[PDB]
């Protein structure tokens, strides 16, 4: 998570990129309370439970949008940017993060690395990248790959200048996705741990082995792959 949130160059909305991120150990604490994110919000999953609900597979996307337009990255509304470039299925189960950033992105006098579609024939089916710029065709004289009357170039540009107001600053946005499926999950929350006391009746928990009793040191010798022992009648009488 640390590098995506700190990647130096984010792509523009139309060319948003993914990461088939899996088989790892998330930790949303600092991500939640980094005290810098102007817009943290999400759906489907509460902002606090998400510390531990283990996930099947998670996808991370990122782009850069105009400032005020940020709201349009949410299910069930419209806006030129959410209309043609990126929209979220109404059964969305992830989280959306946005924070102001012109101190990194607004080259003074004007940034021109960030472009977004304006005209397309069809509204955009959720979760697709449509990179190929197409000249818009309107009424008579439809135009393809040419510039003239009745022909409109689709990729406009952001003029991200620091002299702009808050409403037009650039925003680096990153959006997550979570889902529940059949095969056993692969990305769980960080697991709280603690010291171990001996010779007292305690409630222990080793990895999921749960019980209560008094723990002493032993004279057994497991096999390197063996994680706990049990006796006849199948009660746990040792642990690693």
């Amino acid at each position: 998570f640390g590098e995506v949130f700190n990647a130096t160059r984010f792509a523009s909305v139309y060319a948003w990129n993914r990461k088939r991120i899996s088989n790892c150990v998330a930790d949303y604490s600092v991500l939640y309370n980094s005290a810098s994110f102007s817009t943290f919000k999400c759906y489907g999953v509460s902002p606090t439970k998400l510390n531990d609900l283990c996930f099947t597979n998670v996808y991370a996307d990122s782009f850069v949008i105009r400032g005020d337009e940020v709201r349009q990255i949410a299910p069930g509304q419209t806006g030129k940017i959410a209309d043609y470039n990126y929209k979220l299925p109404d059964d969305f189960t992830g989280c959306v993060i946005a924070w102001n950033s012109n101190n990194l992105d607004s080259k003074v006098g004007g940034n021109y690395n960030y472009l977004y579609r304006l005209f397309r024939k069809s509204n955009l089916k959720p979760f697709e990248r449509d990179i190929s710029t197409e000249i818009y065709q309107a009424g008579s004289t439809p135009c393809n790959g040419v510039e003239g009357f009745n022909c409109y170039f689709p990729l406009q540009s952001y003029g991200f200048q620091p002299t702009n107001g808050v409403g037009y600053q650039p925003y680096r946005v990153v959006v997550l996705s979570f889902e529940l499926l059949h095969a056993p999950a692969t990305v769980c929350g960080p697991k709280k741990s603690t010291n171990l006391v001996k010779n007292k009746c305690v409630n222990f928990n080793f990895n999921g082995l749960t019980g209560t009793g008094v723990l002493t040191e032993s004279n057994k010798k497991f096999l390197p792959f063996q994680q706990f022992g049990r006796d006849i009648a199948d009660t746990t009488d040792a642990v690693r």
Epitope: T8, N103, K107, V108, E147
Partner: antibody, heavy 122, light 108 residues
Framework: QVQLVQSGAEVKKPGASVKVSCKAS????????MHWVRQAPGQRLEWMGW????????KYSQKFQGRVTITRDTSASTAYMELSSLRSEDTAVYYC???????????????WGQGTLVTVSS | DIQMTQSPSTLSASVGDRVTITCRAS??????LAWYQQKPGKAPKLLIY???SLESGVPSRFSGSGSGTEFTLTISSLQPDDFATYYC?????????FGQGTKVEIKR
């Protein structure tokens, strides 16, 4: 491998105008970025401006404002430069640069033309 | 406008050695920079962009660093193909400028 080539040597006179041009050869034209820069001999390089080989955009410098112009021809896939009101200083070597490829724009010159020599004399 | 001056000026070396270059900026730069190699009588070749990244097709020796204002290039072993000047480009703001020139030599 993308390569850029362009015109040969020129010699002009004060007050005139000159037109240098470089032809492109790139695997795709994904809003290509022909992007001009010049060098007085034994001096600091100096940056001209960038044409948006995608469509038409023409951001220029400020020391050179109001007297230099840049265009391009789509079919020939070349870039056109134009300067007027020349004077003995602009004696230099002129360069084509650009050619991002992966993303659509940068501001760093990763494909350089082999150089064009311009002499302003009387 | 952004000023770019390199304190290194000319330098000295010998084959199989390491060198360092400093590029200072009059103002703050958010790690926007690139390093160009220019042999005499040729066209510039790019080496480093965004002050860190190593662009493809170059020897692995070259390496960038630095952030903020003071920026640094460094090569481990000095090969013959290293014998030319080196420039730093800022691209924090508008009109994009260049350095002064930092030219290596062959000590004897």
């Amino acid at each position: 491998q993308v390569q850029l080539v362009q015109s040969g040597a020129e010699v002009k006179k004060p007050g005139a105008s000159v037109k240098v041009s470089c032809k492109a050869s790139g695997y795709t034209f994904t809003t290509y970025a022909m992007h001009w820069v010049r060098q007085a001999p034994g001096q600091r390089l100096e940056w001209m401006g960038w044409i948006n080989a995608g469509n038409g955009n023409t951001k220029y410098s400020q020391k050179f404002q109001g007297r230099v112009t840049i265009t391009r021809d789509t079919s020939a896939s070349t870039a056109y430069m134009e300067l007027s009101s020349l004077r003995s200083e602009d004696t230099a070597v002129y360069y084509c640069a650009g050619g991002g490829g992966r993303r659509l724009q940068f501001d760093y010159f990763d494909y350089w033309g082999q150089g064009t020599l311009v002499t302003v004399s009387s | 406008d952004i000023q770019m001056t390199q304190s290194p000026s000319t330098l000295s070396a010998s084959v199989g050695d390491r060198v360092t270059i400093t590029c200072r900026a009059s103002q703050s730069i958010s790690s926007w920079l690139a390093w160009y190699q220019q042999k005499p009588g040729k066209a510039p070749k790019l080496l480093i962009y965004d002050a860190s990244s190593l662009e493809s097709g170059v020897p692995s020796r070259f390496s960038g660093s630095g952030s903020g204002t003071e920026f640094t290039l460094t090569i481990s072993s000095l090969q013959p193909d290293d014998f030319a000047t080196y420039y730093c480009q800022q691209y924090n703001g508008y009109p994009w400028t260049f350095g002064q020139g930092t030219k290596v030599e062959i000590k004897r």
